[PDB]
Amino acid sequence: NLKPVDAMQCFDCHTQIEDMHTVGKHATVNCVHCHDATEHVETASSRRMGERPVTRMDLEACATCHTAQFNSFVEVRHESHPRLEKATPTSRSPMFDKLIAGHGF
């Protein structure tokens, strides 16, 4: 279970994040949803990072509160033929190999 951190502590150094976070629709979303900054806060100065905080980049960090958008995003369209080569007579560019010779494609 996540425990919230005091964002006011971060805002002393992170004034651009403060201006963005406090005004927008994530004003109530605590930093702990995406950052583990415990050792960072202990070691940082106003101009030196100290220990680097961890930042979550996985999409599940957003899926917790936005499951509908996440589930719609990850759906696989099976009708979109997979690994279908464009340089064939039934696809987009029947003469592609002749025309693109010399290129990695």
List the binding residues: 10, 13-14, 26, 31, 34-35, 40, 62, 65-66
Q: Does 17 bind ligand SO3 (CB under 6 A)?
A: yes
- Candidate list 47, 83, 103, 105; residue touching a second copy; CB under 8 A: 83
3-state secondary structure of 11: helix
How far is Cα 11 from Cα 19, in angstroms, rounded to an integer? Answer: 9
Cα-to-chain-centroid distance, residue 52: 18
Q: Does 37 bind ligand HEC (CB under 6 A)?
A: yes
By the 8 A CB rule, do 32 and 53 touch?
no
Q: Which of these segments, 10-18, 20-28, 34-42, 44-52, binds a second copy (CB under 8 A)?
A: 20-28
Indicate which of ligand HEC, a second copy, ligand SO3, none lies near residue 100 (CB less than 5 to 8 Å, by partner kind): none
Instruction: Report the residue number whose CB is nearest to ligand SO3.
Output: 16
Burial-class residue 31 by CB neighbours within 10 Å (0-12, 13-18, 19+).
buried
Number of Cβ within 10 Å of residue 67's Cβ equals: 10
User: Which residues form the interface with ligand SO3 (CB under 6 A)?
Assistant: 14-17, 46-47
